[PDB]
Amino acid sequence: DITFRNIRFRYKPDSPVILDNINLSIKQGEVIGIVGRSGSGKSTLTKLIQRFYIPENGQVLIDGHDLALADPNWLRRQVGVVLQDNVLLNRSIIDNISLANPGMSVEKVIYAAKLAGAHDFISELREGYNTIVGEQGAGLSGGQRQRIAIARALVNNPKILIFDEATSALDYESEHVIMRNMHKICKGRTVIIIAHRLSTVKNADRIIVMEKGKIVEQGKHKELLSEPESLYSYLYQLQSD
């Protein structure tokens, strides 16, 4: 259960307030989607759930524990973060996946790759998992590199997973391939999907619409879309006009 209590955030000491007084409570296992126009403030949630951003006021807490007092590694074992990662190291495919967990089991590498939906296209290259991804000869697709990353995050078994614009730089097809796995990737996890494309968050258990640092609307895709005058309905039309 992730919670934002009367959160207020600024980037620098005396700059504009980005998040006014956010209050949000994400239930365990809930797959929540967060959308909004430029300036909404959604681009600060990930770094706040991690503990990079420090709230000027209020508190962020996981499972009841205030993150300002939580242990760095504990917090790191709790949250898995997937950003738009289109850069790999010139190592094997498998070394790129276990980059953070050195001598981890090949069995777990495979298990993670499977969940991420990267196993098949991987065991399809010349040398498979041992294929040198040296950004020169072994050229993968953006959608594929993005999936290698989803693997890294899933290496550990994150009870909380955050996709922050993870697929915004991909075209419909590429993203689609990935959205097909989201069901199994979400199994037994609390998931936050922050995206630009409202369609990406279409089947979330609930969508949060942010605007100007504030939460203005929230509900299931269909509830929001049934209100023609809703901001969500406006944004939805825009990505299809």
Tokens at 205, concatenated: 């258990």
Strand order in 190-194's β-sheet? 79-82, 160-164, 190-194, 31-35, 206-211, 214-219
Q: Is 80 annotated as a binding residue?
A: no
CB of 139 closer than 8 Å to CB of 131? no
Q: What is the identity of the amino acid at 186?
A: C
* DSSP 8-class letter at 92: B
CA neighbor of 93 nearest in space, from 58, 64, 75, 120? 120
- Residue 126 assigned as binding residue: no
| Among 34, 39, 37, 38, CA closest to 49 | 34
Cβ contact 213:18 at 8 Å: yes
Secondary structure of residue 77 in the 3-state scheme: helix
CATH fold, domain 1-241, is: Rossmann fold (3.40.50)
Is residue 91 marked as binding?
A: no
DSSP 74: H
If you count DSSP H runs as helices and E runs as strands, how many of each does the chain have, helices first? 10, 10
Say if residue 159 carries a ligand binding annotation. no
* 3-class SS of residue 193: strand
Distance of CA 206 to CAs 44, 47, 81, 219, 222, Å? Answer: 19, 21, 20, 5, 10
219 is in an annotated binding site: no
Q: How far is CA 29 from CA 41, 112, 162, 170, 190, in A?
A: 24, 19, 13, 27, 4
36 is in an annotated binding site: yes
Q: Which alpha helices (H) appear in 156-230, and where do they start and end?
A: 172-179, 182-186, 221-225
Residue type, 196: H
| Contact in structure between 215 and 206 (CB atoms under 8 Å) | no
187 annotated as belonging to a binding site for a ligand: no
User: Does the annotation flag 42 for ligand binding?
Assistant: yes
Cα 163-169-173 angle, rounded to 5 deg? 95
Q: Which stretches of the chain are DSSP H helices?
A: 45-49, 72-78, 93-97, 106-116, 119-122, 142-155, 172-179, 182-186, 221-225, 231-238
From the CB of residue 133, how many other CB atoms can be counted at a distance below 10 Å?
23
